[PDB]
């Protein structure tokens, strides 16, 4: 639907979709799209209001310029930031390990005050990383992604608390700007106020107010209504402006002689000097909105004007009096209520744009205080604009952000959906925000405002639940950073089509309708009443007159990864969350078959994932080949697409790609041309459809274990590809320079039958565990060999050498062909790190079959390892002779409340056999509603079932009584949906009909080849003699504490001591036991370790004489 060449996936839905899904990747591209300032965003935020737009960079320069020294004799100004064209295209930048950027130019001008000059000079600011078409960045060849961050928005926050002593209500306020000072207006258990600005112990409201230039009469005039401040003024003890101004200054410093500076300069240099205290363009808006200030205004400023303060002051006193509304001279009346910190109306989302703008600003705040410092001590009249601009700090800051920053993460891409959902993520943790251990379980809970903005289902299971969430489908980011959602406004019970994006603030004030309401052909609520969501957040019920807004469609709450689970409204939240988190972990198979029964988010989430080569302009195919395709547009110029074949992903998967068109086909703009890793015909296909039964089979699938058939191994139905990358480097050492050469110290000649004449192996060599990949050799140095060895070299006429055999050998348990070999050299201009003459990398491919130990999983969160793989001949086979493929257990279905995975098992069979409603005289009651043209479907037909609007419990049962016979008229699955299986092992049939169907399962990326480990004796750390391993090093297992407790509970002293002494640290013990073992003698009885003759020395180093008696 609304896609040129998409497949025809029948749908079970009943409602319409007035609004179609947005540009899922918009939150990254159209969000970036504001630092550069491309005309695209110009028109976007110029047609929908936005009187005057200013780019992300321009908004920095226009706050930096004009550079002015303290002498006031000269000035520097910046303007017109523009970008050139990129140097190297994406692909090349991904291959040569060079960062994908473009040049940045800013017009700079210096002017003198004595006489003045008009020197304008285009200053090159440096390289700037650009955002690829998919929304990711390329840094040093690695594809990284920036993740938006949730942060409470600067502004005014009120609140109230109860004291246990007297049990009254104390109403506090706070004003939190970006890079400023905080001043809570507390209201103590007693009176009167909590003026304690900048956290200095307190102050009285009349002090700061009067010090602002207020007569003691005006205070009682405005704020007397409102008598609680009468006591504040009475007990203030101070009369006059400076009489309390110098007291404020005292409490601030303290301990310094008061003056006229310490009285007025301070106050005017903490709130009204827009260089040390400035609340960003957002705060200046959240404050006006909260209070009833200039709100109707193009207003643009960052100084906390006196007025605002006074307002909030009385606001506070009005709160702890008992009232609802508040007004101010000339201001729009606002309601009085304590704000909530977690409400999605006070929690903005700094996207990838503001994070880069912040880094650019922090850099400018280093490159800025380098001109005005080299502006006085330079030769005046001899300086040119470029002579002052030391750009280096800015590029350094940028590179220090895109690297080593905990918000720039390697794009988790082992399949299209994992990549798509790595973007659109919002993590409340990270820099500038809260932490993971210092944030109580309040920011984790789901708030009734998250409906439509953040999905409540999708979230990690580890110690991050609630801290890392994902955007919804229809949501959209405001120009400030607040998340919006589209509603349809209904006027007088007549549902219209005027879509209106509401934020989180202006949603509670109104009344929101429900998605699935009985509208009758016009927009009239058939029934007299309707469900609603009132301000507070409760679920009320109202008449069909107050309803003004209504959701555009169900599944608004659901994210993208979640909107692909069929029958979601039948699964529990735990299992639904596990299913949503176990899809971004699947692996791309070799065939990539589409799912038989999914939802509408398949076709519309692959073309947006950025791994499906989409025809750009409607043309006609001219030539196709596994390597590339060419389209001949209707207007002359053609265009050649280059599909990437067998490219390694970041997690080791395969990035294959293959055309899906012929040499004559006509194509239109948007249509799919080449499939992706996990796509099929241009739509997500993460796994395969397998015939599954639901019986427990003789104890091989016990407690989540799964058994398979050999067919899935013979017919390459779950075979996957994996490409690993090994790397070695040859540097210069103290004795010389390491050389990568075919020559080697004492070694055989059968371990060189695959290395080319110059070391590195030849492409196509079937390597295995232990073999050699790169021939390296390092200078030995100089030593002196004992007799036994000199009398041995003489015998074998092999004079010794001065090199060590330190090559690059394949790690343990790894095989497969050698695909690619990359080589960089300092002698060949191939830039590399310091002290590195050469650097080689070797890619090894491997086709992994399914094997017991590999984890599998369906969409509904059900998972399990593969325990047994029976031959194809002993497996419960239907009456025809078709063996079931997988055999799931029953005891896992009921107690986990995921009966969803059963419904799709039933439907999965229907859509596999194909039905035809027998309504040739009249549509049966059960199926007189759902669609038309869905009363019959050819065998092996595709279908769809939207998340909360799909098939119905009473419809499957109607689609299960029409299951046309396979070849000879013989219905195999009776009405209830159960077959009569024959026991392939014993021969006779099972005594009860068993449930069978077609389930869509996926092979996760937790294969045993990754987990299996072992270590007999490896390398040990030098400082601490405990075992240690790395890439090609075993590593050693960790015998923790509770294990020692268990050992002691057994009373096994010798085993514990052995695990503690001759296996971890005792160097004289490990070798003395290894020698015994290898010689076949008795293991020496564990004595007292040598780690006890070191405690005595460490004590005696303190003048403590400890003696063993």
């Amino acid at each position: 639907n609304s896609v040129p060449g998409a497949p025809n996936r029948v749908s079970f839905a009943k409602l319409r979709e007035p609004l179609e899904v947005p540009g899922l990747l918009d939150v990254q591209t159209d969000s970036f799209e504001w630092l550069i300032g491309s005309p695209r965003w110009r028109e976007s935020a110029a047609e929908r209001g936005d009187v005057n737009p200013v780019g992300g960079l321009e908004e920095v320069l226009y706050e930096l310029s004009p550079i002015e020294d303290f002498s006031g004799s000269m000035s520097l100004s910046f303007s017109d930031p523009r970008f050139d064209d990129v140097k190297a295209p994406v692909d090349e930048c991904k291959d040569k390990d060079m960062t994908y950027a473009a040049p940045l130019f800013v017009t700079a001008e210096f002017i003198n005050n004595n006489t003045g000059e008009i020197k304008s000079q285009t200053v090159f600011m440096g390289d700037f990383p650009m955002m690829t078409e998919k929304g990711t960045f390329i840094i040093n060849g690695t594809e990284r992604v920036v993740v938006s961050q949730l942060v409470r928005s600067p502004g005014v926050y009120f609140d109230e608390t109860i004291d246990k002593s007297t049990d009254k209500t104390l109403h506090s306020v706070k004003v939190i700007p970006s890079r400023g000072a905080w001043l809570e207006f507390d209201v103590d258990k007693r009176d009167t106020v909590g003026v304690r600005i900048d956290r200095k112990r307190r102050q009285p409201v009349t002090v700061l107010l009067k010090a602002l230039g207020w007569t003691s009469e005006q205070i009682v005039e405005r704020f007397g209504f409102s008598e609680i401040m009468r006591s504040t003024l009475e007990k203030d003890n101070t009369v006059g402006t400076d009489e309390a101004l110098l007291d404020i200054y005292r409490k601030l410093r303290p301990g310094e002689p008061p003056t006229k500076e310490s009285a007025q300069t301070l106050l005017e240099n903490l709130f009204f000097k827009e260089k040390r205290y400035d609340l960003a363009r957002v705060g200046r808006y959240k404050v006006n909105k909260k209070l009833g200030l200039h709100v109707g205004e193009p207003i643009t400023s960052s100084t906390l004007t006196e007025e605002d303060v006074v307002a909030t002051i009385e606001y506070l006193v009005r709160l702890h009096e008992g009232q609802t509304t508040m007004t101010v001279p000339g201001g729009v009346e606002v309601p009085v209520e304590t704000d909530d910190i977690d409400h999605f109306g006070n929690r903005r989302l700094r996207t990838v744009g503001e994070l880069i703008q912040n880094q650019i600003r922090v850099g400018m705040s280093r490159m800025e205080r380098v001109v005005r410092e080299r502006m006085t001590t330079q030769d005046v009249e001899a300086i040119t604009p470029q002579t002052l601009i030391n750009i280096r700090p800015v590029v350094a800051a940028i590179k220090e952000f895109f690297g080593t920053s905990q918000l720039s993460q390697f794009m988790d891409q082992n399949n299209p959906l994992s990549g798509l959902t790595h973007k659109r993520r919002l993590s409340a943790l990270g820099p500038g925000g809260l932490s993971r251990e210092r944030a109580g379980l309040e920011v984790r809970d789901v708030h009734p405002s998250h409906y439509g903005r953040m999905c409540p289902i999708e979230t990690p299971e580890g110690p991050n639940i609630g801290l890392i969430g994902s955007l919804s489908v229809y949501a959209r980011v405001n120009p400030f950073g607040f998340i919006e959602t589209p509603y349809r406004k209904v006027v007088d019970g007549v549902v219209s089509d005027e879509i209106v994006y509401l934020t989180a603030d202006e949603e509670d004030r109104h009344v929101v309708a429900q998605a699935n309401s009985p509208i009758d052909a016009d927009g009239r609520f058939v029934e007299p009443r309707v469900l609603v969501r009132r301000k507070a957040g409760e679920v009320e019920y109202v008449p069909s007159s107050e309803v003004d807004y209504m959701d555009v469609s169900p599944r608004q709450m659901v994210s993208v990864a979640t909107a692909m689970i069929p029958f979601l409204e039948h699964d529990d939240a735990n299992r639904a969350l596990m299913g949503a988190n176990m899809q971004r972990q699947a692996v791309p198979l070799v065939r990539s078959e589409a799912p038989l029964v999914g939802t509408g988010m398949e076709l519309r989430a692959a073309i947006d994932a950025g791994d499906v080569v989409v025809a750009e302009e409607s043309g006609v195919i001219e030539e196709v080949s596994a390597d590339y395709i060419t389209v001949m547009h209707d207007n002359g110029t053609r265009r050649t697409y280059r599909m990437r074949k067998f490219a390694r992903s970041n997690h080791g998967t395969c990035a294959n790609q293959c055309p899906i068109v012929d040499a004559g086909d006509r194509v239109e703009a948007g249509q799919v041309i080449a499939d992706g890793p996990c796509t099929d015909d241009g739509e997500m296909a993460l796994g395969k459809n397998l015939l599954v039964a639901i019986m427990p089979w003789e104890g091989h699938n016990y407690e989540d274990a799964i058994i398979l058939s050999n067919r899935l191994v013979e017919e390459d139905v779950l075979t996957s590809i994996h490409i690993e990358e090994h790397e070695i480097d040859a540097r210069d050492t103290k004795l010389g320079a390491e050389e990568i050469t075919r020559d080697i110290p004492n070694i055989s000649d059968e371990v060189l039958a695959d290395l080319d004449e110059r070391g590195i192996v030849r492409i196509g060599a079937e390597v295995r565990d232990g073999d050699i990949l790169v021939g390296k050799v390092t200078p030995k140095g100089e030593t002196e060999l004992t007799p036994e060895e000199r009398l041995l070299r003489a015998i074998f006429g092999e004079k010794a050498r001065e090199v060590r055999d330190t090559s690059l050998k394949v790690p343990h348990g790894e095989s497969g062909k050698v695909i690619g070999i990359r080589v960089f050299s300092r002698e060949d201009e191939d830039e590399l790190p310091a002290g590195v003459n050469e650097l080689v990398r070797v890619y090894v491919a491997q086709k992994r079959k399914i094997s017991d130990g590999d984890k599998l999983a369906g969409r509904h969160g059900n998972k399990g390892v593969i325990g047994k793989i029976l031959p194809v001949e002993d497996m419960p086979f239907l009456a025809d002779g078709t063996p079931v493929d997988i055999i799931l257990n029953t005891h896992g279905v009921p107690r986990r409340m995921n009966i969803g995975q059963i419904l799709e098992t039933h439907l999965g069979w229907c859509a596999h056999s194909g039905w035809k409603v027998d309504a040739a005289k009249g549509v049966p009651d059960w199926a007189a509603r759902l669609p038309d043209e869905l009363l019959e479907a050819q065998p092996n037909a595709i279908v769809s079932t939207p998340v909360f609007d799909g098939a119905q419990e009473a419809e499957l049962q109607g689609l299960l009584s029409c299951t046309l016979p396979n070849r000879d008229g013989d219905v195999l699955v009776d009405a209830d949906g159960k077959a009569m299986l024959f026991d392939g092992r014993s021969g006779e049939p099972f005594p009860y009909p068993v449930t069978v169907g077609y389930m869509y399962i996926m092979k996760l990326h937790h294969l045993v080849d990754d987990k299996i480990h072992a270590r007999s004796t490896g390398p040990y750390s030098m400082i601490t003699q405990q075992p240690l391993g790395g890439k090609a090093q075993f590593g050693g297992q960790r015998f923790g504490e509770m294990e020692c407790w268990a050992m002691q509970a057994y009373g096994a002293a010798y085993t514990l001591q052995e695990l503690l002494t001759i296996k971890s640290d005792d160097t004289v013990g490990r070798v003395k036991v290894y020698e015994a073992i290898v010689k076949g003698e008795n293991i020496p009885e564990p004595g007292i370790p040598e780690s006890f003759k070191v405690l005595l020395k460490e004590l005696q180093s303190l003048c403590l004489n400890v003696e063993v008696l």
Binding site: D188, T192, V193, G194, V195, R196, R201, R202, Q203, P204, V207, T232, K235, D236, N237
Partner: peptide, 24 residues
């Protein structure tokens, strides 16, 4: 009487610790 609280009890300890550190 807007003297909040704990200002004296905190300042006497701060000054005492500062005097100790200067004595060191």
């Amino acid at each position: 009487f807007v003297w909040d609280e704990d200002e004296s009890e905190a300042l006497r300890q701060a000054r005492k610790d500062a005097e100790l550190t200067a004595s060191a």
